[PDB]
Amino acid sequence: VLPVEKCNLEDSACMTSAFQQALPTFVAGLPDHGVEVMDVLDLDDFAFDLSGLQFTLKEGKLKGLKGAVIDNVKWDLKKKNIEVDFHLDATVKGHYTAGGRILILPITGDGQMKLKLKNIHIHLVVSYEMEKDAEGVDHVIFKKYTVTFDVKDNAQFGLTNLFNGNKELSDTMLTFLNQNWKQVSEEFGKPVMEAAAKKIFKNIKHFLAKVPIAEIANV
Numbered sequence: 415v416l417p418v419e420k421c422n423l424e425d426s427a428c429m430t431s432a433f434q435q436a437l438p439t440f441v442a443g444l445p446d447h448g449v450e451v452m453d454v455l456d457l458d459d460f461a462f463d464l465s466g467l468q469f470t471l472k473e474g475k476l477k478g479l480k481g482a483v484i485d486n487v488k489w490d491l492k493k494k495n496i497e498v499d500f501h502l503d504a505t506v507k508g509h510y511t512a513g514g515r516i517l518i519l520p521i522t523g524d525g526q527m528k529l530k531l532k533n534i535h536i537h538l539v540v541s542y543e544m545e546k547d548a549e550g551v552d553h554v555i556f557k558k559y560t561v562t563f564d565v566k567d568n569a570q571f572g573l574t575n576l577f578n579g580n581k582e583l584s585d586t587m588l589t590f591l592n593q594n595w596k597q598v599s600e601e602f603g604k605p606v607m608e609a610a611a612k613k614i615f616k617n618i619k620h621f622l623a624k625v626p627i628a629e630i631a632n633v
């Protein structure tokens with residue numbers, strides 16, 4: 415399993431440093447807990463219709479979670495809530511399509527995407543409950559999460575076969591995207607975020623349904 419020593423759950427310095435040190439092994443996958451490979455992370459296909467853009471990503475991938483930096487862990491035992499702050503440079507790949515408009519430009523494209531995220535900050539809030547399982551050990555059972563984000567340094571857009579390959583229009587569109595990267599991030603990033611959070615919350619939840627609380631915590 416995991417090469418990390420035991421914390422008080424509300425010792426938030428120990429928890430931050432334990433998350434830090436446990437990450438590479440966790441995101442390499444643990445098949446007998448619930449833990450897939452989380453770098454590269456396979457995202458479920460999704461679709462959205464937002465601010466006039468119709469957007470699909472198929473066989474989506476997220477690379478860079480191996481590389482993430484844990485900023486703070488705040489486990490709160492009265493609230494049975496956990497807050498997790500981190501950041502990373504990520505890449506998001508996959509087969510995309512594009513319909514309708516982005517902001518003031520019309521868009522059509524069916525090809526490949528490579529987004530590069532530079533210093534993306536995440537604020538993950540998880541609520542939980544303590545359950546006993548079948549064999550009378552308690553586990554931390556995650557229930558619900560909120561997530562917020564913040565691409566602080568930069569976002570770049572690579573999109574192949576825009577407007578059926580027509581250079582003029584593709585270049586114009588990609589220049590637009592790349593210049594207003596931050597508005598575009600705030601305008602369309604939430605369902606891309608949701609897509610990874612849905613998988614990340616799921617994987618953690620699996621882990622801790624499998625390991626006894628008495629096993630990884632101070633009682």
Ligand SMILES: CCCCCCCCCCCCCC(=O)O
Binds near residue numbers: 422436
């Ligand atoms: C996005 C990366 C999150 C993956 C890490 C999941 C949390 C594992 C808990 C590690 C802390 C151990 C607690 C303890 O031993 O006291």
Ligand SMILES: CCCCCCCCCCCCCC(=O)O
Binds near residue numbers: 529606
């Ligand atoms: C064509 C518009 C696509 C919208 C992408 C905007 C950039 C937002 C990145 C989303 C965050 C990725 C999730 C994560 O870092 O775990």
